[PDB]
């Protein structure tokens, strides 16, 4: 609703997780312009810091309410509020690392509330994640489509490395409204996530993300719709 999701919205996030058995907690808050598809966040490691792995595997887990949509693509996730939605993600990294994530999103007292759980496993002890050799995500295209009564997204997601190379992951996410709301058809979401600042050990980190939905069919008529 245009009433309940305002042009500027704040959020609080809590993550509990483990990577290669190393347990941690993160608390953060953020803000942005949901209909414009822009947001920032500041995250703080509150337990298990400093983290012995790349911040970059956590950054994409910290807000799909802030995606710009053409007027004629049902904004399924915005419409799930105030009750909200859940998402479940699997990231298969090319060296056998795996990240599984679950998230609950709701709207409480006019603020989004995000609860995240993360399990990262089988990262090579001397690979770029555990050795902190990553340098942020390339811009991504998430292919969205409805399936089994939920909204699914698939990404071929690419991390830049300090050595000039790259490090890839296959990602699939299911996004499911807690109440029935109309699912969209297939379309793409262009995403760019930046680490804007961090302290030396990444126990305080600031992110920015821009995300915009675009039609993937419909030709010039649907182009730049909205
Ligand atoms: Cl407003
Ligand atoms: Cl506010
Ligand atoms: Cl979306
Ligand atoms: Cl493990
Ligand atoms: Cl390890
Ligand atoms: Cl970055
Ligand atoms: Cl659609
Ligand atoms: Cl478009």
Structural domain boundaries in the chain: 1-226
Say how far apart CA 39 and CA 81 lie, in whole Å: 18
* Cβ contact 123:53 at 8 Å: yes
> Residues with Cβ within 5 Å of ion ligand 6?
136, 194-195
Compute the distance from residue 93 Cα to the ligand 7 centre, in Å. Answer: 30
Q: Which ligand is nearest to the CA of 7?
A: 1
Number of Cβ within a 10 Å radius of residue 85: 24
CB within 8 Å of 181: residues ≥ 6 apart: 74, 76, 79, 80
Give the ligand at the shortest distance from the Cα of 214: 8
Cβ neighbours around 42 below 10 Å, total: 17
Nearest ligand, CA of residue 29?
2
DSSP class of 173: E
Determine phi and psi for 195, rounding to 5 degrees: -85, 110
Q: How far lies 76's CA from each of 3, 149, 152, 180, 197, in Å?
A: 16, 12, 12, 9, 32
Q: How far is CA 151 from CA 1, 32, 40, 92, 184, in A?
A: 19, 23, 24, 19, 8
Instruction: Find the ligand nearest to 185 CA.
Output: 7
Q: Strand 111-121 vs strand 9-19: parallel, antiparallel, or unpaired? A: parallel
Distances (CA, A) of 162 to 129, 170, 183: 11, 21, 40
Query: What method was applied to determine this entry?
Result: X-ray
Distance 145 CA to ligand 7 centre (A): 9
Task: Find the 200 Cα to ligand 1 centroid distance in Å.
Answer: 37
Output the CA–CA distances (angstroms, integers) from residue 116 to 20, 33, 59, 119, 134, in the order listed: 17, 21, 12, 10, 22
> With contact defined as beta carbons under 8 Å apart, do 24 and 17 qualify?
yes
Cα–ligand 1 centroid distance for 5 (angstroms): 8
């Amino acid at each position: 609703n245009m009433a309940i999701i305002k042009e500027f919205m704040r959020f609080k996030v809590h993550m509990e997780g483990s990577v290669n058995g190393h347990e941690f907690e993160i608390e953060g808050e953020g803000e942005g312009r949901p209909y414009e598809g822009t947001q920032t966040a500041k995250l703080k490691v509150t337990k298990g810091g400093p983290l012995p792995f790349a911040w970059d595997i956590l950054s994409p887990q910290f807000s799909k309410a802030y995606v710009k949509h053409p007027a004629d693509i049902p904004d399924y996730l915005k419409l799930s509020f105030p009750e909200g939605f859940k998402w479940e993600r699997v990231m298969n990294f090319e060296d056998g690392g795996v990240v599984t994530v679950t998230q609950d999103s709701s709207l409480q007292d006019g603020e989004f509330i995000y609860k995240v759980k993360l399990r990262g496993t089988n990262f090579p002890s001397d690979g770029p994640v555990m050795q902190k050799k990553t340098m942020g995500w390339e811009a991504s295209s998430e292919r969205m489509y409805p399936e089994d009564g939920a909204l699914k997204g698939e990404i071929k997601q690419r991390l830049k490395l300090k050595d000039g190379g790259h490090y890839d992951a296959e990602v699939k996410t299911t996004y499911k409204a807690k109440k029935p709301v109309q699912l969209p058809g297939a379309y793409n979401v262009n995403i760019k996530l930046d680490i804007t600042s961090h302290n030396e050990d990444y126990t305080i980190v600031e992110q920015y993300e821009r995300a915009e939905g675009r039609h993937s069919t419909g030709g010039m008529d649907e182009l730049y719709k909205a």
